[PDB]
Design a protein around this ligand. Structure first.
Ligand SMILES: [Mg+2]
Ligand SMILES: [Mg+2]
Ligand SMILES: [Mg+2]
Ligand SMILES: [Mg+2]
Ligand SMILES: [Mg+2]
Ligand SMILES: [Mg+2]
Ligand SMILES: [Mg+2]
Ligand SMILES: [Mg+2]
Ligand SMILES: [Mg+2]
Ligand SMILES: [Mg+2]
Ligand SMILES: [Mg+2]
Lengths: 173, 173, 173, 173, 173, 173, 173, 173, 173, 173, 173
């Protein structure tokens, strides 16, 4: 999987590939969407199984419900619960949560990561390749957020045998 | 095990072999049915033990009871429960769920997989071989769903030492 | 251990050897009975320790109590419980359950296995050898159920270092 | 450890050595008693730690309280509980239970073993050596139960680096 | 694999199935012959890869060349070399060597096994099942060597997921 | 990797993908040719590293040099050497060798495999998927060897994360 | 395996059972001789495969050839070679070497063991049980060497699942 | 991670680096703060994930709430709970707790460590290097607490591949 | 750690070193007291973490509260609880408990060990060295309890890399 | 380590960082050069230890000596030797070999990899990140080879905890 | 072990502790010298066993003999041989080689490390602690090389349970 978010200027994008892999060996679906809206202001992308990811999304919605305009706090509360709940701990996933304003990466080790100044966040087997590629373009004139994101996904997914070339795209802002 | 579903035209079929293997070594039964009807509109096939599969079937019936004509939703709710319930998580199985309209694959990793456009879904040690074979025939003139499914089962079960040549067949639509 | 059941004609037999082995290397008892009656219609043989086997027998009696004339259903319910109960899952055993009418094999993987048409079921380290031997004799004129079972036990228990030549015998139907 | 019981004629003996070993390496006590009376009619010897063994003794007393003159049943009920109780299962021990009439060996695998006709039972790292030695003497004129037991302990404990030459002795029956 | 030899009366047979399995998972060929003649008086069947088996056959021919009418000695010399040669020891195979007069089983553990009085020898994942089945029939009137062998192969190969129903047959003697 | 050969009619084809994967994780080259001609009559494809595959190719050329029109024999001699040479045994590869007349698969387990009647052979992580797909089309009117091979490669390489969509093609015949 | 030697008075006996076990689970031969003469004065019994044991026997003959009337030295030289030769070190076996005068046990750890004053030596899975039994009888009036050895083999082989009741016997010294 | 506290004179400092590392191989954030105030008198630094560390911080706040002016006791009570709570035990973290007066190190092994007279405490992969460096400077004229801490962080974080050069600083007192 | 108790004459001493080691690699504190008084008559030393040891101390105080002048009984009850409580079982520690009259060693294996006649008890990585040294001096004229204990601690802590030369001393008694 | 080569236009650059890491955890040198010239036309960079890398360099010089103007062939011959030589196979390294004309990557798996059309090759823990970054810039106006390489090294070495910011640079062309 | 070298000004020192540890557990000698002169200009310290270290010293003397005033080259040639010689590779050691002019660290991974500008090099379990401490003092007025080295050794050896407080000292330059 490769989920990438680039914020540049008045815009932020989120991309994910669509490959589901079994046994680290075979592609079982090449057209699975890994991004979900949860309102007008917030989208989220996931690496991990449908069930794991969705269970964690729902718990996150509850944390946004409780802390309505502190995205970061909700994220942290989610991570806290995730690490202490026996059930949740049996799940593997990583999430990126995106608003017009903030972007957060949350994993099952309990890290809650915001971008450096460059506005770049990524998860998945392909994520680091994407981050690298994006960073190469972040300060180059003519490259808006989307263009950066697309070129980086191409590069990352070409590299990552566990990610494909078919992407979902969200934009905010 | 090999369970295969092919949807072509106004018809969908589901096939499963009948081999039960112990210790990945020996055949203990060559005549076990791996398909269950649960009403007029829905059949389901399983890879895994009688007990594990059935326990998961029953939880799925409950999810259909609660979400009566959203087969996909029921599947997703099942997967959610399966991944978070301590007990269910100790079970190994995979399911394919078939209606006139939809087909879903659900596993214990929490994946919920629908076919690509070709209408093909399969699980079990033989499943991917069957999917490959079916995809070779999906767009070929003269091959309806049943004929495709039978030829692919022959091929896949000939290859998979854990699947046999005796099949159960369901048809819908 | 070797527990074998052969049904031929209007007769069924159940045999078990009497060896208890420790550490997979030394015989601690050569005279342990591995068969138990639980009413007039039903006997049961076990591979596994006295305690594990009996605990599972008692849970099975309860399942027969709840589903009085569906031996098969009780068996399945037992298997279901066995697979989902944390405690039961820590036990190693396999059972064969015999009535005049039905014979079932239940193991800790959650399989519930009925014989093929040949009426033969067996468990234990020696079970598959016994099954093979019995099958060779099932359709031969002059061999009733008991005679088949005895010859197959000789053969299987000669081969299995974990089974001995001393057998308990039940007859029904 | 070596605990040995020999029943011959109108007499039964129980012996245990007195060595406590740590880390399978060093002797921490050479004068620990491994036998306990629990009334006039019943003694018991243990292999395993003081705490484990005693916890299991107490549960056994309760089983004798409930089944007052079925020593064998109590033993079996104890084994049943031991195997299903999460807590008890974390204990390592083996026990021999002796009355004028019966002798039983119970372990943490859930075996409940009575002697063959020769009246010999043993547990511990040294137990099998002792059994062998005792059996050599069981049918020899001039050797009563005690004499057999002592000679066998000498032999077994000389062999077993985890047992010593200092023994506790009980006689009944 | 299943290679079986039955000697009864003035006749001996050797059978082998034809399944080649990769990764203990998939059938790569269902029509591979596992028997070789090496002159008028001697045939040999193998479990193991073409290359391993043949390399060992050739070394065996050399041992027969050197010890021309002591089949048993040749076998033993082969086993001796096989166990001490670094190269040969990296091979996995088992062989059965058959003449009008003698039958020997040789493996990579260095065992050299001749039949018991019943004239039955077998190797391969299926071998023991076959032996069991054959032994059940060895003393039954009407069953010559071939008939026994065929029925046993059916039974064994039906059981062994790593053996198939297509057999090669040699007869001597 | 996916290397596939289909012989139908007076024609045989050989295809290989071009992906090189490191650490089972990342694509390091997407344009590597895995097929080599060695004269006018013989081509060969490999799964494995450039160095391992080539070393084995050269030893195979020598075997053809020595046994000029027994392709099968050369293959077998190669396999024999490969399995007994200490150095060669440290290599991982699989080969398919193709002439107008014969096709062979050789691996590092020492198997030498010829097609069944359907004329199909394949190796690599994607090979079995390709074989399945090809077999589905082998007897269907309109599908010559090349067309079969291309469709099966699409299917297999779409499935195998370790194979790509860029193929080299040889034809003979 | 159980090989036992008892020296009492002006007599020494050597016994071995005849069971060959594969995979530590099935008996492949119940009639294999584990004793070999090598001249008029010296016999030897082995635990381990025919090939390993014989290879080591032959090296021992050479050591006796070089040190003709120091049985003990030959034994030690053999052990020395066995421990330093790469090839020999890959073999599993233990030997007992018997003359009218001396008895030695040699293993693959490089121990060379002579009896205590009681004249008893034993190897194999069953060896220590046999030693224990023999020691119980060594000093009892009426038991000559053979009688002791036979009773101890019964006892040890009854206990050892890897030894049987069929014995070869040599007498000297 | 490197968290360091140096107390010298009427001043104490606490430093932490800002690197978050994934998979022990890649830096995911170089600007994460690892220090938290919890009132006017007490700050705390952590090695471990945001979620684990914060969960443990909150439990510590509760312990300070219950034992208001025994920092050391709270620390010990926290450690006690941490070691006995199933959930907490699944977390990896280490903490340093600092007041004007006391400094404590608490880890998941249940150690509660106060500085030696030199006033130095440190945790993390880099902690022991920092301790070593600080100790070299503790008694040297001209080096106040901050200066010592800064130089030791440079040194330790230069060495530790899992710590970076960007530090957060607290001073008390 | 090294905790040692020597009782000689009308005096008993208890000593412990002060080293705390992390990761079996580094000294984190060289001045940690490992002895605690709990009233006028009883002191106790521990090997293990502050938290584990203290938790177990407190449970021991409760056992003394309940069995006020049976120190041995309290110890045994503690051990019983410790071995059956899920939480306590996750702790590693060993204790020595000392009164004017009795001395006991308790570990997490559930052993409860009293001295031999020589009045010596010790725990920790250095404990057995200390016991050896003390036993060498126990019967030598001029050496009272304290002098013995000090010399043995020197010797043992010089040897044990996990114990240091700084000791806490208690005397009774 | 990060070694990167970018060829763009009539220029090629080769960069390597200078960090040497021990135990995958501490930096032992931050100023080690990982590039070596070997004549006027050819430079080479290495990941791996000085000794391993240099040993392999010297063998490569010999291969260039033997195949003077086929850089690619030398590389392949080196890889061949490296994979078959027992000694060389014990070394861990990867190399990049650069001339004005060709660039090759050689590893210990025996891969020999040339760049895609983009002219980019990289090895080391950081290599794939550098490749990703370089690829993002390869086709952008204003970025010559050096500028691309420098920016990609910054990015990759920022990410790779096993690479640093200090680089050696060669230019050809 | 801790071997440390500090070069400052016109002077270089080399120190080593004297502790030999067995089984990572016990000190077997506290007075072993780990430094050797090999002429007037060169000393060397080692971590590792006497035999390993000395064998490697001798090979190094030969390399200095061959490259008389290129200390660095000799070191590199030694490392080269060490990594390719089968025998040498079975040794564990690390060395520091010191002259008036150069200092080199050589290990069994094949690294050859010279100091950074600060002139500090160290090996052994304690080495990194020493390096850290030394670096803290390197630029501080009043601290010559020896004084730095001594203070760092104190600190490092106090930390490292595998190093002691007794040091050997050489001075040059
Ligand atoms: Mg890809
Ligand atoms: Mg099949
Ligand atoms: Mg048997
Ligand atoms: Mg002893
Ligand atoms: Mg089969
Ligand atoms: Mg693919
Ligand atoms: Mg036996
Ligand atoms: Mg750093
Ligand atoms: Mg010490
Ligand atoms: Mg870095
Ligand atoms: Mg120290």
């Amino acid at each position: 999987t490769t989920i990438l978010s680039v914020r540049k200027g008045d815009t932020v994008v989120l991309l994910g590939d669509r490959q589901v892999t079994l046994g680290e060996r075979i592609v079982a679906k090449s057209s699975a969407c890994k991004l979900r809206r949860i309102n007008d202001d917030v989208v989220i992308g996931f690496a991990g199984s449908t069930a794991d990811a969705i269970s964690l999304m729902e718990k996150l919605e509850n944390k946004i419900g409780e802390f309505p305009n502190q995205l970061t706090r909700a994220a942290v509360e989610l991570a806290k619960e995730w690490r202490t709940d026996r059930a949740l701990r049996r799940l593997e996933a990583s999430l990126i949560v995106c608003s017009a304003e903030e972007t957060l990466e949350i994993d099952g080790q309990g890290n809650v990561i915001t971008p450096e100044a460059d506005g770049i966040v990524a998860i998945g087997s392909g994520g680091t390749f994407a981050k690298a590629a994006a960073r190469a373009l972040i300060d180059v004139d003519g490259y808006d957020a989307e263009k950066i994101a697309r070129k980086a996904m191409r590069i990352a997914t070409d590299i990552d045998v566990f990610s494909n070339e078919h992407w979902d795209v969200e934009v905010l802002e």
